[PDB]
Amino acid sequence: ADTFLEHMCRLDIDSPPITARNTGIICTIGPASRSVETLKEMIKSGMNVARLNFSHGTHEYHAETIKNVRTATESFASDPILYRPVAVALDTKGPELPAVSEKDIQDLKFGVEQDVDMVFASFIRKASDVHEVRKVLGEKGKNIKIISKIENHEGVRRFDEILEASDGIMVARGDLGIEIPAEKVFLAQKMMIGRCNRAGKPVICATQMLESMIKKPRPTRAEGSDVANAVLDGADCIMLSGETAKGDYPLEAVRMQHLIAREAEAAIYHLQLFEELRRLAPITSDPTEATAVGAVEASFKCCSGAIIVLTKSGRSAHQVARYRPRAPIIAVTRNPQTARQAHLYRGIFPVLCKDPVQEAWAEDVDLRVNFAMNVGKARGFFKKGDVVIVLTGWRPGSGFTNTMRVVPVP
Amino acid sequence: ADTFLEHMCRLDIDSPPITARNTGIICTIGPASRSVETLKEMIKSGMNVARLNFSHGTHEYHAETIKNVRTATESFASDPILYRPVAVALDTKGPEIRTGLIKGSGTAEVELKKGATLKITLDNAYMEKCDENILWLDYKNICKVVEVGSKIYVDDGLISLQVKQKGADFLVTEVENGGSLGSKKGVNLPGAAVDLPAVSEKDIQDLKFGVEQDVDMVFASFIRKASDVHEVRKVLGEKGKNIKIISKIENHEGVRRFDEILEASDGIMVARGDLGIEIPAEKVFLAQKMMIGRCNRAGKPVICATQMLESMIKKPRPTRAEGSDVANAVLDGADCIMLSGETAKGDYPLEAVRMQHLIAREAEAAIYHLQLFEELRRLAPITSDPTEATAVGAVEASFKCCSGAIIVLTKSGRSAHQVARYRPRAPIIAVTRNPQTARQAHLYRGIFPVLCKDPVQEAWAEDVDLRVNFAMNVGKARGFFKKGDVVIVLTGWRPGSGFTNTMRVVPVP
Amino acid sequence: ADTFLEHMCRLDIDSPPITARNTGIICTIGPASRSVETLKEMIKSGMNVARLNFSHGTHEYHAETIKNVRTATESFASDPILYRPVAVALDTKGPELPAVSEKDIQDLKFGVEQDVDMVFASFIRKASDVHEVRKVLGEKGKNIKIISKIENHEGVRRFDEILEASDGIMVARGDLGIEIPAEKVFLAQKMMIGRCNRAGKPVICATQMLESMIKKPRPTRAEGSDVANAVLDGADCIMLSGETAKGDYPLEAVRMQHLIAREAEAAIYHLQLFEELRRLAPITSDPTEATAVGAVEASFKCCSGAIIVLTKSGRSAHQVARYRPRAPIIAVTRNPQTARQAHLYRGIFPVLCKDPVQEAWAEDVDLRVNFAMNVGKARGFFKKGDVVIVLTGWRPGSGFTNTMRVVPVP
Amino acid sequence: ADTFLEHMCRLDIDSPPITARNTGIICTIGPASRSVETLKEMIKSGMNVARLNFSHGTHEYHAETIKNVRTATESFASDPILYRPVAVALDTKGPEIRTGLIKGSGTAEVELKKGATLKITLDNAYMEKCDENILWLDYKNICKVVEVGSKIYVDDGLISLQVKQKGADFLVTEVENGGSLGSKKGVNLPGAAVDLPAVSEKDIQDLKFGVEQDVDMVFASFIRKASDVHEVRKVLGEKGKNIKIISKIENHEGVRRFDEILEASDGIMVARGDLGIEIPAEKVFLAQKMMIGRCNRAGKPVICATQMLESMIKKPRPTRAEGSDVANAVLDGADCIMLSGETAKGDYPLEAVRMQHLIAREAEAAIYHLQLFEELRRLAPITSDPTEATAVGAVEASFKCCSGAIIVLTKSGRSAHQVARYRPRAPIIAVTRNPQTARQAHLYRGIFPVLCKDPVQEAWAEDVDLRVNFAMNVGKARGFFKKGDVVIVLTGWRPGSGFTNTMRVVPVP
Ligand SMILES: N[C@@H](Cc1ccccc1)C(=O)O
Ligand SMILES: N[C@@H](Cc1ccccc1)C(=O)O
Ligand SMILES: N[C@@H](Cc1ccccc1)C(=O)O
Ligand SMILES: N[C@@H](Cc1ccccc1)C(=O)O
Ligand SMILES: [K+]
Ligand SMILES: [K+]
Ligand SMILES: [K+]
Ligand SMILES: [K+]
């Protein structure tokens, strides 16, 4: 469809969703979803990130939840083609005042010891709050991603400085609804998602998603519409709260979130996002940035099934994700943390390569690429005769991901 | 802003809304909003259309409501610069199923609990003895159209039942979703072949009454196909031929047959709550976006209805969710938003109108007008009709010479509607001497109708200048523009002209 | 054709020119072309402007040439549908030094007395030279158009100030070839034509056009290519010199110029010219300028046969011509001078309405429009059922041409 | 500059050319330019291709010219960073008609005057007795293909005759355009069905000689249709299969059948002067623009030839008109410009090469590169061929990270040609070990070929790095870029790769 309007006119409620669900699903784990058996089913149904709410519970309790999450996750490790990484997120209590309380310091230190992937930092009002959280995590927690939660007016007013200091953003709509009038929160949500998309940083929408599923096996029309519109605004991930933490239908909530998010993909008009993001980006001569733009460009032309990115830290894959290709970004990494953290970005499908490093660099690249091809075929992103883009460095120890290759799927 | 993304990035919740609210507000009038004094305040606060729900009330009652609406409306007629036309809409009963009266004395509500049994009866002895065990309803054929396993929804989806056993004139059900059952509530039978007619005997009488009362539009309930629309058209007849028919899409068949319904109707109402019963929750937002899109493409008005500001029945302010849902209907492309119980029977009818106005006005800052137009221009079929070429040219000019308004001199409204299809940012000031045309124009996004009551000058060019000067005064007073801005003026050429084919670029003096 | 490249690829030398010749033809009148009988044939064959070279001849001699031009021109006046206005141009001797010599002053005064339409001012080096010519023409000659001839390096270096002071420009390629190297004159030509197009002022290419036709009935391949390329650069008019003044085939020269210019129209890609001219124009709220842009825009959409402009001074038609529509601009005027001067602009087909003024303004407009419709049908610009754009003012005595009308051809 | 118009407005005759000359220069070698010392100077001054005209001379003579060209070319081989490849082109005689020898002793020229009679004879007694009354020519069938009223042109259109009477073996004509008639001049019969074969007995021998001499390309004369091209291809055979065939379009039939000729050929030469005889003057500029356009769209080389700098046969500087005509051929999209008598037999062969270089270099300032590419990208068919996608991506990147060059490692040249089709601003440094590939690359606008003479490294990645480093040194020395600039590098992935499908963004060390 050559216009957004025609894209809307062609939507059909009777035809099933042909496209993959490209947004992350974050689920809050509590008494209802804590057991290894429930977590297994939640992972199969689409959970990408387990969130632990440190407003409640002891460290002993959370250590057991984390252990259960990992037991459930690694139960699928025996098939590396189908294995999905699952991230762990620590959501701080925060001030209920200083940015980091005595309790938050202890909780953050515990997160470092437990090897969590990301921190959702509560009640962030300004940049210096983010830097205080960074300082507590320290040298040992330096690769842990900090997602600043915008929960009040000051957070919204000072958004630009908070965004620049953070690794990502969580929009807490319910908390914003208390301090900001109802007729304005939807504008704040749209503003913040937009600015995050422009900056290439993850944005999560949270609170008041599928709350009615705490008691019911299906959500309301309004809730489906609200979740869908967060996806269409440009959210990278959607987070579920009590629905998965303590409700009666945690597994049904994950499945419904998956269905809604997958339906919303049919309303996304991908070409416009990219053309605007390409024009708004500053003119640069950084090799990686030029290669990322070129890859997304090629992914729209030679109607590509995927952009395969070989990445150690995830950074190269994130640079591609900023431009919002339609094609999935298969991020191949040997770093387990990188694979878990990648779920924060819309359209990144991380895969953890567990094979050992080959001495000949070109053979090692070919092995990781072949692994990505098998994963893509199995997930139905592409098949034999399709073409994909492959991004790598040139030589072992390259700082740039500056090599782009157009490759037919064998 | 040259990109949609930058348009979103520049949104600021602290800066007040610089732009006008361009969508229509339709309010349902009932016991809470019926009086001349309340209506006056609702009109000042932004009500453009009064909706009368003929599911309830006698013709005598509705005649008095209509009279009160007109008394309130004409109380502002002494200042023709500030006078706002107010339309009247008749919303038909249609093929409804309803429950009976709650039993006994005391509170007129009973708690139905999940897992509990409930017998549905058609025995008229129980018509006014509804309770936790027995529920009467008025659809006699219900046992022929429903099976074991069928779902039955009561009171706009509040309560749900599953049929466990059929009988001759009864059904034993189990309550799936509990709630308070009141008296005379609406019943939906999803996936059931309900044999009730499109226009009942009662609907015929109601439609004839609407013609006699000179209503501006009809909201036709439960439209399933084009022939239902044509039956409504036939009843309105020659005498009601200028009354606009808005088809309500309330079920799956309505959505499946949307194209034929749209082509037969003057416009569409999307009833989201009713659609939520028959269609899964994960799909209704797609149906809403599809239908609004197709209406925008066809140049026909689309109204979003149900589940707008329902919490304001009891509270002076809406929830964050409701604000977000209303706003998104506006951003999808809705021409109007309709309020139901919030204005009809709730405790804060005036606050509901004001909040709807605030939400809709805030949503305008998120609308990216240039994209809508560029796409609507490309999707329109290549034509040599003078009026269509002039309408496109006017909207084009309204984006270039950053225009404060497109002024359209129109008798029937049609010329102004053709401009509105292209979705200019600038307001369309539709100047007309026809009072009905001025009322009906509120159905279209971005049309600000003004009723010129001055007599016709013999020299045509002087008459045009007089109507344009009237539009200029109205625009200055509403803050659309001021001295030094430029406006587009569309007219015919000569008094007999069939086309609105003349465009004029005019500085505001 | 949606691209310039495809426009070139579709050119067909075997199909005849479907489009009108939109550039003006200026012919130098001398001993070979001076007679009433030859002028008649030159006018029928396409001459729009008669140029008189005041380097030679007495005032008596030139008065007779002017009289012969007018006798020939008015011989077609009995049919006002087919009558073509013919302009008279005085080309000064100039310095062969002050801008205006004693001789030039006398020649310019004679031009005012003879009611010439335009002056081609020789050897213009700077703006003050143009203002001296303006001062000599004075109040009585204030509507006479001054075309500055750029004949040397200083003229090119100071082009912007000369252009701003002049009504139009003549590029004298042969004279430029003496003072500027041959490998650079083509750049000067392209630069000057471009700047004139951007400013909305007429530009004429002169010298070394069809010189071989002084002795031969047909031009060379090279000369055809050179004339054609001046048209494709954006020239409004092409001027012939000795070919028509003193050569053996003056009538054949006019006809060949017409054929070359008409062939060149097939290579003009009109949509690009307009889209660029629209973007480069400064953002304004002048009603006439907005209406002119809108008219040209509409002329590309409702595939218009013409833009009809009712104009007293010509200015409204010139403002439309700046945007380079494909459709011919039929400029209807009662002012005989306006009709003659309009030939300086590419794409303007002037028509002189000789009917008396109707008292009712709307009827007078309708009469002039009907006249334009008959002229257009007769010239084959359009026929019954086509649609045209009509531009007018609103009341009698309107300063703006701010009214645009889409009109089917009856 | 964001518009073509502004690009023209900013042209400045006082500022020197900042950019390289990107079009090829082809020079005809004859008595004036034949010596090793002159060729050396012509190569330094910018000659990329030496053309040998086989209309005249023996094979012995041409073998010596070819040897001199190679001696001159290889004299610069001692510095492989600065060495420029020089191609050799064989231009066939084809089906030509020629006059005989001028009579008697004295001057070898006679004045034919307008209105005078001239008898054309086929009697071989008059073969060497041509004068004002009698002219012999070598086309025996001429009387069968010409009528009364037919025009006959002699010596590249200098003289024109009209046939007044036919005979068995004679034609009586009247001279229309007079001039000096010399010996053995070319004869054109416009609109006549000349039955001469596409490849004559002589052309077969000349083409076989070209294969033996290892020429790089053939300019095939008087190509009228695709089958003529295939006959030339067949004669070159298996041994001459990599020799490029450039079809010369010299008549109306060539233009009418252009598409099939283009599809059969490796490239095209537009012979404007020859076209000017058979096609009217007011149409040849359209044919030139059409043919260049179609060649650009197809990605095949197009050369403009004839009537370039002809006045430099006698003068050290060209005319304004000639400079303008050459410049406009470049701006139309020509890949190369060919010089004829200016370099073959004139008094200033070296000055002609230098002036051609200056004109072509000046014309680069008027080229608007971004438009060419954006249109060529849109007009190209949607494909999934890896090399084509990579070529487009490389040119795209060359406009963004303001690249100094696109470096392409290529064996046959094909990968570099695929990049050249998209018309990047940045030079395409085509690195090859194949000497023929390096010579043939000059046919394409914007390809700067470099011949790597270093031996192949066993490790593929090291070999790539070596060739890339060689290209970097060549680019630094030519001033295309310096340390800190960024370039695009295209290669295969692995030594067995069929595709050039790997693109690398590389800072210049
Ligand atoms: N990152 C999420 C969502 C996703 C799915 C498929 C492709 C891209 C993204 C996942 O791996 O499940
Ligand atoms: N038609 C509505 C909404 C509107 C307001 C302002 C401008 C345009 C439209 C009204 O008149 O109030
Ligand atoms: N102005 C010239 C050329 C022209 C012809 C036709 C249309 C537009 C322009 C004329 O009137 O003859
Ligand atoms: N191919 C020619 C012209 C050229 C020069 C520089 C860059 C590109 C092309 C050469 O190598 O000399
Ligand atoms: K928390
Ligand atoms: K109703
Ligand atoms: K002169
Ligand atoms: K030859």
Residue numbers in the entry:
A (entry chain D), C (entry chain C): 23 to 118, 218 to 531
B (entry chain A), D (entry chain B): 23 to 531
What does the paper say about this structure?
Pyruvate kinases (PYKs) catalyse the last step of the glycolytic pathway by transferring a phospho group from phosphoenolpyruvate (PEP) to ADP, thereby generating pyruvate and ATP. M1PYK is the constitutively active form of the enzyme and despite the high (96%) overall sequence identity, M2PYK has a low basal activity but is activated by the allosteric effector fructose 1,6-bisphosphate (FBP). Each subunit of this homotetramer consists of four domains: A, B, C, and N-terminal. The active site is formed by a pocket between the rigid body core and the flexible B-domain.
